[PDB]
Structures are given as C-alpha cells and as structure tokens.
Design a protein around this ligand. Structure first.
Ligand SMILES: Nc1ncnc2c1ncn2[C@@H]1O[C@H](C(=O)NCCO)[C@@H](O)[C@H]1O
Ligand SMILES: [Mg+2]
Length: 210
C-alpha cells in the first residue's frame, strides 16, 4: 500500500533549484547528510539519559557509509532517533521548521548552495548527486517506513518490511550516471576528512564485496 503526496510548493521549488542550478561543488551533500545523522544521534543520546529503555533498540550510536557500484547507490546509515510516519511527511515534505524561504531569498542575494545547511534544508542537497532518494527509517514509537522521491513534485510513503532496522535512518542515494565518483573509497575518505572530521560519532566506510 503506497501513498503518494505532493511536496509543499516551496519545497518543490527548492528541489528544482538544486537540480537545475549550475553548481560544481556537489561534494557538500555528504557533509549535510552526515550532519543530519549527527543531529539524530544527539537526539536519541539526550532522550536516553532520562529513559534508558529508548536504547533497547540498539545502544551503539554511529554512522555507516555504504557504497555499492553495482547498484550505483551510496547509503548513509545512522542509529539516531529515526522518524515516525508523520515526521517523514512533515519534515521532508513541507517547510516545517526549516529556513526554506530564507535560503531561496539568500540565493537571490548572493549566497551559494554550499550554505544550504545554515538554513536547515541540507537534506535536499542529496539531489545534487542523486536522481532518486529513498529514506528508510525506524523510530521507537512506530513501524518502519520507506519514503521515496525522484523529485518532480511528489514523494511516496509506504511501510517497509523484511529488512528491519533496530532504530535510525538510512538515506539511499541512487546516483546520477555522471556522479559515480562518490562511490570511490578514496573520494569518500577525502570528503569526510575535509568536511566531517569533527563529527562526534564513529563514521565507518564499508568496503565493497565486489
Ligand atoms: N538522519 C535523520 N534522522 C532523523 N531525522 C532526520 C534525519 N535527516 C533529516 N531528518 C529530519 O528531517 C528534517 C529535514 O531534514 N527536513 C528537510 C529540510 O527542511 C530534519 O530537521 C530532521 O527533523
Ligand atoms: Mg524514542
């Protein structure tokens, strides 16, 4: 059972800009997704201080980076707080608490796309390198869901079964054909060292089986 939703207009406009603006410094997408994971880990860390049972779904707080050249995917996995179904729909589908409006105004007034994280919309930088993004997520208060969008103004949400996570979020980037550099181990290492070296959780780069 798949539900289809329209992005809020301003989010569709933001996505279109990210997809269509000429901008070569695409590598910042990884910093933005890792920062979102770090925020999610901070949140479950804090909540678990006063309710240790919130870690029954996994004590380890970390980030995994999983390249797969066969599938042309890069996946960013965390064991953070995760998202409920409502969280997915509100947080990824609408302006919500973000600075979407301020960012689009800023770009008209001299800002550039690398500043996207200052405005709380770094997630959408995924579309610098991905033709499709799938978000698998599990919150302690809810079942596992899959959010998906290839932009074009809509996204889908469905329940996700058969491969349960304990808790957290997986952002699966189905890369554009000319963005496969982000599957290369030396490139990923370079970007993590350059932009994410102070993140306060372990970041493990998986090795490919092929
Ligand atoms: N890795 C993640 N884990 C849990 N929640 C996440 C997440 N990445 C993004 N989110 C949620 O979705 C929001 C988000 O990025 N919305 C898109 C920008 O408006 C975050 O503020 C955050 O609430
Ligand atoms: Mg919880």
């Amino acid at each position: 059972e798949v539900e289809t939703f329209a992005f809020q207009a301003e989010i569709a406009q933001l996505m279109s800009l990210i997809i269509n603006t000429f901008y070569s410094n695409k590598e910042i997408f990884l910093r933005e997704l890792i920062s979102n994971s770090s925020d999610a880990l901070d949140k479950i860390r804090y909540e678990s201080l006063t309710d240790p049972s919130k870690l029954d779904s996994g004590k380890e707080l970390h980030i995994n980076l999983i390249p797969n050249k066969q599938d042309r995917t890069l996946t960013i996995v965390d064991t953070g707080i995760g998202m409920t179904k409502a969280d997915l729909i509100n947080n990824l589908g609408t302006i919500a608490k973000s600075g979407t409006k301020a960012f689009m105004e800023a770009l008209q007034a001299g800002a550039d796309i690398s500043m996207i994280g200052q405005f709380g919309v770094g997630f959408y930088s995924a579309y610098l390198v991905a033709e499709k993004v799938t978000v698998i997520t599990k919150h302690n208060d809810d079942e596992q869901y899959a959010w998906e969008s290839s932009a074009g103004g809509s996204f889908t949400v469905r329940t996700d079964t058969g491969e349960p996570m304990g808790r957290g979020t997986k952002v699966i980037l189905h890369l554009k054909e000319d963005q496969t550099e982000y599957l290369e181990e030396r490139r990923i290492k370079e970007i993590v060292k350059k932009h994410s070296q102070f993140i306060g959780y372990p970041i493990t780069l998986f090795v490919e089986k092929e």
